[PDB]
Design an enzyme around this catalytic site. Structure first.
Site, PDB file in Angstrom:
ATOM      1  CE  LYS A  96      -3.649   2.317   2.471  1.00  0.00           C
ATOM      2  NZ  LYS A  96      -4.641   2.245   3.540  1.00  0.00           N
ATOM      3  CE  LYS A 100      -6.337   1.917  -0.002  1.00  0.00           C
ATOM      4  NZ  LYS A 100      -7.145   1.788   1.282  1.00  0.00           N
TER       5      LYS A 100
END
Ligand SMILES: [Cl-]
Ligand SMILES: [Cl-]
Ligand SMILES: [Cl-]
Ligand SMILES: [Mg+2]
Ligand SMILES: [Mg+2]
Ligand SMILES: [Mg+2]
Ligand SMILES: [Mg+2]
Ligand SMILES: [Mg+2]
Ligand SMILES: [Mg+2]
Lengths: 326, 326, 326, 326, 326, 326
Positions: A203, A251
């Protein structure tokens, strides 16, 4: 890859493109409803439905309204929801105790959905930033730095409370080192043998989370990844797999499709990707302005499948499922 | 990739993230102005600047105005422009003859820029669709199919006209099979030994080109690639390299970053990517609406670098260059 | 690598070389100030600046002078210093107790720099050879051999004293087996969670260290690597990564660029390289004699980046940063 | 590379380093005299030896003197010489005709050496820059650009003249595209079936050639490679192998050892490297100044072997050979 | 491997073969004395030298005679001996106690050689088959099967007694599972930190050991490897590396060069090979009959180097060293 | 190769070795009679069998006797013979014309065998050295060098004569560059579409051919390969496959099993190996002397299979076939 000495005009790659039937026969990837996970913003209270200016068409829903909307999500064949509680301001605190409250929004919503829709996957968010006073990622030391291991203690309590509420999947989004292993050991110790852990593995510290922040009511570079770094994502995922993650996620989504591809190619593990609030907002806005055709929705999602994703967290999941059934 | 048994807590990937200086030391990729190519829309008159509705902040410019703004682009260090003429409707025809007109907009703009800014790279667009009656991709048979080799004959004449005008780079965006080799052979036979060919190698049948139509005033599946297909892109690139391309391009851009990755990884050749009109418009719209911070521009462009791109065609080039400078 | 059947004259690799703009577009690597670490020799006392005959232009600096010079290193954007104390002869001893003295030069310099320049990275040298009586690498047994584990005990005390002084990075240069893991466990046990360990992983027994030895006031084959061996470097680095190193280094630098490349390619980890005293001296001397143009400095450093280094320890760091800003 | 779970203390890489005998047993690479090629600067007169200021200890020699010193080189077992004539200024011209003169220095030296030492390899330099008016790399157009194919015509005549003089190896250092194939075809058509072609394949636009100018009495970026570029070297080598090179070379040497590594790894073909004038001068200067031990010579040359080189062009060949003998 | 489209007649592989100098330049591997280990058969008693009919030219030597012969082995530069005691029949026993006797032949010979030739490597044989009553590989259960772990207990005692006698290397030839790790832990526990373990990793059940059996005075398929199996050798070596071996060996030698190659290629570790008694005998016999030229000795040994061996146990080590010095 | 973390005592590789049945189940390679090719020495007379001194047990046979023994070879299932004629000295000449004589021994033997045993494979030897005045490898220039292309002209005529005689396989053992393509093209143009070409691709300048000279009654380094060279073999094989070889061969055999391995691994093509006269003689001599058990024959041949060989040319074929039968 071996090019096999293919050469024009013996090889004309337009021949397979000539007719729909042959384009269909050679089509390498298809998106189905099996690929879609819907993130949903969950309010406290009853009979609440609130629009989000930065996310046109997305509403925050009280639990009663969520149950009603879910009947149709299930009818569309959407395999799972990912829940994101909108925490009341007065429940935010220094040590984020609300994260593990059995009467917290996430816990209440989970129990309600598990009872009402027993086949629907519920993915909870293991994260302290909905519960900290100013949306910081975890427990702060005296320098304002997010303490790694102390934050994990709280994350573990939270994960256990989600498993107790019946969540089939917990998804830690906190980017603390070693939290996947800590959460897995605690689940294992407590007999939650089959609770899945969907790691937010790679992420990135991103500008694309802006509208989500608006939706939930809320520095990043000390825990989230530098968008410049690709090799590093492999190290992140290798550790989460060793620590027991059942699924690993990248992400944001479309701005990191190269990362989705490397991760799938290197580990051959269930690989997920989050098409984040910012991605949704820029697509929706462009569609509303008449700048992009509606067909861009399925194109953007097909990209994730081609790149190697097994599932996609996307605010478009209902629109896409509609356009796939039809 | 060898994970080398790295394990928490001996390995904590947050340690390098702890301070700006270590983040800077381990940073894997950096965008610079030498990565940027600015596409420009070119008008047929004098003293003309027009705003494009579906591309907020992008202008169509007469050649005199282009010459003026190029002073600023050169001062910022932007290495090259990609010219896209806005063809008057009267000059459009079934045989696309305007494509190779020595006084076409593209040819006039090229001559003017080469004289005024001798160090500035000019990349012309080898394409029939700006010159055909209804924006079809090439010469049509009775069935309305875009004939491959017959369209190539026109593209070759056009590429030669661009070379004669002094373009250092011709970039065929047409997606006919074998056109790279045909253009290269023509250039070689005519003695244009150093004219670069930037192939649009893996160009997808995409919804992201929407706003481009509004800029230039204009069945795609029979020449442009199916968004589902990744392996096929490698075959497209391998052919263009064999046929003599000096650089190869993926288009669109962010929706196909996995393709950029695979192409750079397998061929290790100069690899380019187009952040297309729809990507620009999506981002610009969200920024203008205050939904996304202006920092997404550099984030979007850094992605291309991390994915493997050597150069990026982007409407954000001037903005990006000003941010990189300051 | 797939050659893709590229063949003269369709492929002419000079076309991209024809113009500055295209050379810039295809340029595979660029050196920036983010890549540079300055090694600095630190004296006891006050108002000391001593030239080093074998390292023209490099001075040893007392701490007061180091603080003054550092203002400008920081202004140039140099992310980190690596400190090398010049130990007073009378402080050298059989069991190297000075290594862990909180009032040792390295410890004093560290505390002073951390207070004055809070964003500047300080990399300390974990090593016993500045503190042993005749510059031996560690604690000797009765045969004059450097004892592995006993030396590590002392190295660990030293590493802890550097962390206590506030060093963000400790860099063990001793080449004892297993010292990386020993130091990491001790840092972890003592709560120094974010102190980086920059392992000198593949350090060779080299003639190129001569001028450094002159600069600090000072057999090698039983711990340092045989310059003949390349496969062995992979085993060295794999172990240091498993043991918890945040960064791994090759030393010397330019004479081992093949090793930098293999290490980056195989492990995909933050990879550092030391352009040692001998490399600096031979370049500087040749420049002063008018044998080599000044442009050789940036060429030598670009080599490290191309080879796969993430950062470079170089006595040229100030000259290079000047030539990069300008 | 499989790390095979090797871990301290079960694995201690110092155990093989403990004694000379085990160090000898595991030693991965050894330099021998059969790796060495001596470049020699050749004068046009008789009884001439001149010292080169920027290459201390290297002499320019008349052919009679070359014949004398070659007795010693042959006795040391040095397999080959690379000839570099020092062309009188009167013989320099725009068309570089001296390049193929049957009585050019290179041609006379070749004939004399082949007769006197039939087993000694002679590698001639196929190059126009020793013969052009101002040391330009080839024939120039009106813009001062080095024309590719027209320069190749001269290089071919020259290669043929070297073959006629009896050179076993011709080594084109010119960096024109396609010259290897053109020279090979000419040699084949003329019946010089066994004349080897040693391509300078990956030759960089480098500052390290500085002292060479002082030896031979003399825009590089438009034919020689950008130091930043590594992938591009593989494309250069692949072309030269396809075109018929018997061996391929990287130049300069130590600053490009990663390139040597990659080339040997990918092509597994006879791979050569040039330790150029600037590398020699840097090392020699530091040795003379007493800054570096004379042992750096063998260390520098061992690097090339470890990196993958089959043979090294080095001005240190005689010194190295004497050290290896004793 | 990439063939790089090399094609006759542009590529003629005979050109490099045309002359000695070029064959030398491209020669991929050379055998040196650094590669050779001499196995020696050691008798009890004084003033003993016994010929071995099946191994012409090889003698068994009492320790006094071994010391005398060793002066010249050392003078030839042979880095190490491997000792094989000829155990008196009356010292063989059910539980092989002689293996660890400090007054056993191997232990006595070791102490004598270590004192007299301090730089000479002594490799001892960790094995129970010289000490068991009928040459069985270890301790037998009631079914006549060689018990794995119980045999390792004895092997460990033996290894410790060799380390005590001063052996720098112990080489377990027993093919018990896990013995490498057992021996390493015992060496580590007892402070024998630098004693090397040279694992007989991939040792095959072979007919080629016949003459050795004659030389030392002496079923195999339950511990030694099936000659049919190649993949299995990788598993054997991976385990021995994990268990702490410093060097790994394949045995027999020439009949398993494919295994030497796979092992070197896969693990990149110090890789040894035993040219066994049978290989020596068949070569020597053929040479004595005038069927094979003496040059076959160096050819057979060069094969091991080409195949990837770092060192070779060979009864030809003296003859080869003579032919290499000369 | 993934070691998959296999570790003692969970992994004990002796468990599969414990019983014959599990050894049989995991056995990776098995020799059969379909792997065997018998080389035979063919005399010019009638009723002739001669013993070869340096090849004990191998006989030279007149064609009538060859026909008789072939009954037994066919009954054993040996798939093919390789013919080696023993040329009378009177038929030897500088131009090697006997090579293509329609009544040469090889041609007569081929016709006789094809008629009598239509299913038996006949592999003829395409080679000039049985027919040249002094056993030189081909046609010589004034310097005594074996001319490549001129020797090929004779080899082509010979290959055609073998095809006309009905040979299913021609096997050129000459090591001229490009001869495979020249023979293939000649065979194709003449309509011999199905004549296989078994290239001797990687044939080393070896001492192991010694006894062969005694069989057939007869500078090698200028066409046969240097024993030191492994990479070069891959280039030899790649060329022969491109030129049309149906199978490729390594020669000699056991001394080059690493070469067999690499060739099979990289090309995945039908790969053959010659267990040459010297390998046979070495083994046979040791067996006759009672130094080695007769089981070494099958062990030596199993090695070839394990290394990757599809077929083995071996003088032990009849013995091996009888052992495999029983
Ligand atoms: Cl041009
Ligand atoms: Cl020739
Ligand atoms: Cl046929
Ligand atoms: Mg992580
Ligand atoms: Mg195409
Ligand atoms: Mg180490
Ligand atoms: Mg080239
Ligand atoms: Mg084992
Ligand atoms: Mg060949």
């Amino acid at each position: 890859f071996t090019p096999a000495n293919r050469a024009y005009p013996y090889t004309r790659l337009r021949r397979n493109r000539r007719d729909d039937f042959s384009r269909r026969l050679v089509r390498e990837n298809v998106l189905t409803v099996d690929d879609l996970i819907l993130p949903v913003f969950v309010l406290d209270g009853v009979n609440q439905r609130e629009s989000i200016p930065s996310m046109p068409g997305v509403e925050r829903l009280s639990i009663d309204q969520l149950l009603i909307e879910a009947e149709e999500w299930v009818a569309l064949g959407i395999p799972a929801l990912a829940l994101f509680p909108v925490t009341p301001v007065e429940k935010k605190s220094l040590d984020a105790a609300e994260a593990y409250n059995p009467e917290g929004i996430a816990q209440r919503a989970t129990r309600a959905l598990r009872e009402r829709f027993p086949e629907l996957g519920i993915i909870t968010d293991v994260a302290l930033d909905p519960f900290t006073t100013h949306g910081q990622d975890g427990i702060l030391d005296d320098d304002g730095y997010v303490l790694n291991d102390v934050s994990i203690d709280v994350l573990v309590r939270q994960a256990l409370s989600h498993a107790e509420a019946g969540a089939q999947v917990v998804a830690p989004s906190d980017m603390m080192d070693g939290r996947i292993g800590a959460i897995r050991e605690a689940l294992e110790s407590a007999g939650h043998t089959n609770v899945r852990v969907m790691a937010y593995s790679a992420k990135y510290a991103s500008a694309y989370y802006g509208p989500f922040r608006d939706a939930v009511g809320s520095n990043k570079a000390t825990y989230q990844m530098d968008p410049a770094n690709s090799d590093e994502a492999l190290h992140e995922v290798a550790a989460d797999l060793a620590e027991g993650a059942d699924m690993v996620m990248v992400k944001p989504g479309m701005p990191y499709l190269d990362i989705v591809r490397r991760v799938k190619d290197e580990f051959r593990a269930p690989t997920f990707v989050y098409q984040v609030s910012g991605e949704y907002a820029m697509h929706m806005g462009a569609i509303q302005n008449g700048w992009l055709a509606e067909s861009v929705i399925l194109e953007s999602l097909t990209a994730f499948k081609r790149a190697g994703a097994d599932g996609i967290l996307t605010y478009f999941a209902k629109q896409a499922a509609e356009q796939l059934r039809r």
